[PDB]
Amino acid sequence: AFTIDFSDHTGLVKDAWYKQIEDLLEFAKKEEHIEDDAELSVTFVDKQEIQEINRTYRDKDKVTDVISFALPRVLGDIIICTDVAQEQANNYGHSFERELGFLALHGFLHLLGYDHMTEADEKEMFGRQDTILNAYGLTRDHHHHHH
Ligand SMILES: [Zn+2]
């Protein structure tokens, strides 16, 4: 099994988008060969709230697109900023909800223990990200964040 506890503090997220994001992350969990039951939470917030969360939890007084908090396997929490995701979606040329899904996938891989702070880690983690997105059908280069 795989359950996402979703929350949307903005009222912007459509019900169809929750399903699209959950289906992508469930596919990723299977591609990662995680057989156990897993659970996680995804919360959508506006730019004022993401800055406050970034300030108090990361000592970064600034807006950002996604924050992941790593801890049935309980994987932790992903927080996504709708304001930033909408602008990044415009810059990459896919929809708001596609960008929400990409940021959720990125956070999910972080919760599994991947990181990209070194070149070797980045190659491993973006290699998995690209492979999952391609296997799901998201093969256009900018759906990978050109990455
Ligand atoms: Zn990251």
Residue numbers in the entry: 1 to 71, 86 to 161
The authors write:
Endoribonuclease YbeY is specific to the single-stranded RNA of ribosomal RNAs and small RNAs. This enzyme is essential for the maturation and quality control of ribosomal RNA in a wide range of bacteria and for virulence in some pathogenic bacteria. Early studies revealed that YbeY was involved in late-stage 70S ribosome quality control and the maturation of the 3' terminus of the 16S rRNA in bacteria. A later study revealed that Zn2+ is required for the nuclease activity of YbeY.
To gain structural information on YbeY from S. aureus (SaYbeY), we determined the crystal structure of full-length SaYbeY in complex with Zn2+ at a resolution of 1.9 Å. The SaYbeY structure consists of a four-stranded β-sheet and five α-helices. The active site cleft was identified between the protruding α5 and α2 from the flat surface of α3. The bound Zn2+ was found at the active site near α4, which was confirmed by the anomalous signal from the diffraction dataset collected at the Zn absorption edge wavelength. Two citrate molecules (Cit1 and Cit2) were assigned to the electron density maps based on the matched molecular shapes and crystallization solution containing 0.1 M sodium citrate (pH 5.5). Zn2+ is hexacoordinated by the three conserved histidine residues (His120, His124, and His130) of YbeY, α- and β-carboxylic groups and β-hydroxy group of the citrate molecule (Cit1). The binding of the Cit1 molecule is further stabilized by the ionic interaction with Arg58 from α-helix 2. The second citrate ion is bound by the carboxylic groups of the Asp65 side chain and the three histidine residues: His130 in the loop (α4-α5) and the two histidines in the hexahistidine tag. The hexahistidine tag was in the α-helical conformation and the loop conformation in the C-terminal end of SaYbeY, thus occupying the putative substrate-binding space between α3 and α5. In the modeled structure, the single-stranded RNA was located in the active site cleft between α2 and α5, and a phosphate backbone connecting nucleotides 3 and 4 was located near Zn2+ at the active site of SaYbeY.
